[PDB]
Design a protein around this nucleic acid. Structure first.
Ligand SMILES: [Zn+2]
Ligand SMILES: [Zn+2]
Lengths: 223, 211
DNA sequence: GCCTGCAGGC
DNA sequence: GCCTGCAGGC
C-alpha cells in the first residue's frame, strides 16, 4: 500500500525506463521506486528494467516485505529477486512446510490464470465477474487476478458495513466501498464472507480447471 | 480576482454572468492516504477585448508541488462549455445547482470573498499561513465550527473512530492548512479540537471586524 | 492532476 | 480502417 519499492509485470509497453531510457515490454518483470511527483499531489513510480535496477545504489536487504506486490509474483521470479537482492527442527520443518505450501498455492494460482488467458477473452471474464455479484475492476491484470480468487476461495459477499466490494492486497483483504462520499470504508480482514463460485451455463472449461482443483483450500497469507 | 500564475493579473479580469463568478477553488482531502489537494479554475475575459482564456491550477495546499495550464479558447462561449465540463468531471455535481452533493474521491467547492513594511511582509506571510488558499466565507467557517462541535461530541462519546475520520476529512476539506508534506493529523485529542476551535474563534472575530 | 497510444465496436 | 473513450504513464 504505502510502501516504497514495487515490483510487478508490465501492464503495457509504454513505460520508459529511468536508467536506460528505453521502452519496456509488456508482460515482463519490472521494478520501480515510488517518488513524490513534482507535478501533482501523490507518489509516482520510477520504473527500471530488472537488469538496470541493481546498478543504481538501492540497498534492499529483505524484499519479502520491503517491495509492494512481492507476494503476487511467480515463485521462480520471487526466488530470482531474493537471490539478486545481494549482488528448532520442529520450527524449521513447520516453516519449510509453510513455504512449500505457499509455493504450491502460488504456482497453482498462476497456472489457473494462464489457462484463463489462453481460453478466455477480456469480455469473457467481464461477464464471469458479473455472474457472482462481483465488481468489474479497471485493468486486464486486475480482472484476471479477481477471477482467479473467486474460482478458488469463493465469490466474495458484500461488506457488512459499507455493503461494498472487497479486494486482495499483499497482506489481507481490504474493502473499497465508500462509508461516505468523503472517505472510503476501511475494512481489513484475512477472512471475508463469501459464497461458492458459480460457473455459468457456458463454462465448458469448468472441468478444464475447476475439476482439477484439489479444492478445500483457504488463502495462506504471508507472515 | 485573477490568478498570478497565469501571467494576466493586470491584463484581464474574471468574466461573470451576474452571480456566476467564473472562478472556483475546490479541495479534496483523504487522511488514510495523506492527500490534501487544491484546484483553481478560472475563465478569464480580456481587460477589454474579445479574447478569453481558460486557466487550471492544482497541487498540494501551501506546497510547491503542482503545475498549471493556461489554454486559449476559440470564442467567448465554448470556453464556458469547457469550464462546465471540467467542473463536473472534477466535482460530480453541476456548475449551478442547489444540490452540493459530495461525491466519492471528488472535490468540494469552497466559498471565497520606515521599518513598517519589513514587518508587514511577515504579517501577510503568516496570514497566508493561516489561510493557505485565501479568505473564506462566514457560511463555510460556521459550517466548519458546527462540524467541530460534532467532533467534540463524537470524541466525548469516545466511539466510532471511523466517524471521527470522516468528520476530520470534511473539516480539513472545509478549512485548508499548510501541513507541508506531512499527513494531516486526526482530531481525536481534546486539546487539538479546543485549539482549532479558538483558532476559528479568532478568525471569525477578525472577519466580523472586516465590515 | 493531465497526456495519449491503443483496443474494442462499429 | 475509423473513432472515442480510457487504463496506463508520468
Ligand atoms: Zn533499463
Ligand atoms: Zn466495507
Amino acid at each position: 500500500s504505502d510502501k516504497l519499492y514495487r515490483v510487478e509485470y508490465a501492464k503495457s509497453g509504454r513505460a520508459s525506463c529511468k536508467k536506460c531510457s528505453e521502452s519496456i515490454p509488456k508482460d515482463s518483470l519490472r521494478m520501480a521506486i515510488m517518488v513524490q511527483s513534482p507535478m501533482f499531489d501523490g507518489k509516482v513510480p520510477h520504473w527500471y528494467h530488472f537488469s538496470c535496477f541493481w546498478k543504481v545504489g538501492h540497498s534492499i536487504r529483505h524484499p519479502d516485505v520491503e517491495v509492494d506486490g512481492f507476494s503476487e509474483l511467480r515463485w521462480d521470479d520471487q526466488q530470482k529477486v531474493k537471490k539478486t537482492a545481494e549482488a528448532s527442527k520442529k520450527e524449521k520443518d513447520k516453516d519449510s512446510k509453510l513455504e512449500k505450501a505457499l509455493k504450491a498455492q502460488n504456482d497453482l494460482i498462476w497456472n489457473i490464470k494462464d489457462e484463463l488467458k489462453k481460453v478466455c477473452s477480456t469480455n469473457d471474464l467481464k461477464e464471469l465477474l458479473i455472474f457472482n455479484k462481483q465488481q468489474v475492476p479497471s485493468g486486464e491484470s486486475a480482472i484476471l487476478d479477481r477471477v482467479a480468487d473467486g474460482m478458488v476461495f469463493g465469490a466474495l459477499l458484500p461488506c457488512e458495513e459499507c455493503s461494498g466490494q472487497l479486494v486482495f492486497k499483499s497482506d489481507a483483504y481490504y474493502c473499497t466501498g465508500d462509508v461516505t462520499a468523503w472517505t472510503k470504508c476501511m475494512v481489513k480482514t484475512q477472512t471475508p464472507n463469501r459464497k461458492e463460485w458459480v460457473t455459468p451455463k457456458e463454462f465448458r472449461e469448468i472441468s478444464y480447471l475447476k475439476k482439477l482443483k484439489v479444492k478445500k483450500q483457504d488463502r495462506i497469507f504471508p507472515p | 480576482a485573477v490568478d498570478p500564475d497565469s501571467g494576466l493579473e493586470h491584463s484581464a479580469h474574471v468574466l461573470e454572468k451576474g452571480g456566476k463568478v467564473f472562478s472556483a477553488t475546490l479541495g479534496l482531502v483523504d487522511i488514510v492516504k495523506g492527500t490534501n489537494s487544491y484546484y483553481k479554475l478560472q475563465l478569464l475575459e480580456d481587460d477589454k477585448e474579445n479574447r478569453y482564456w481558460i486557466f487550471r491550477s492544482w497541487g498540494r495546499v501551501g506546497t510547491v508541488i503542482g503545475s498549471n495550464k493556461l489554454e486559449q479558447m476559440p470564442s467567448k462561449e465554448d470556453a464556458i462549455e469547457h469550464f462546465m465540463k471540467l467542473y463536473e468531471e472534477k466535482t460530480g455535481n453541476a456548475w449551478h445547482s442547489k444540490n452540493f452533493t459530495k461525491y466519492p474521491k471528488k472535490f468540494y467547492p469552497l466559498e471565497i470573498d520606515v521599518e513598517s513594511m519589513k514587518k508587514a511582509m511577515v504579517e501577510y506571510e503568516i496570514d497566508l499561513q493561516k489561510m493557505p488558499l485565501g479568505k473564506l466565507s462566514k457560511r463555510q467557517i460556521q459550517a466548519a465550527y458546527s462540524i467541530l462541535s460534532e467532533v467534540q461530541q463524537a470524541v466525548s462519546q469516545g466511539s466510532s473512530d471511523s466517524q471521527i475520520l470522516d468528520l476530520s476529512n470534511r473539516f480539513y476539506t472545509l478549512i485548508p492548512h499548510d501541513f507541508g508534506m506531512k499527513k494531516p493529523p486526526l482530531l481525536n485529542n481534546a486539546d487539538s479540537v479546543q485549539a482549532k476551535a479558538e483558532m476559528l474563534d479568532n478568525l471569525l472575530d477578525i472577519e466580523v471586524a472586516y465590515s
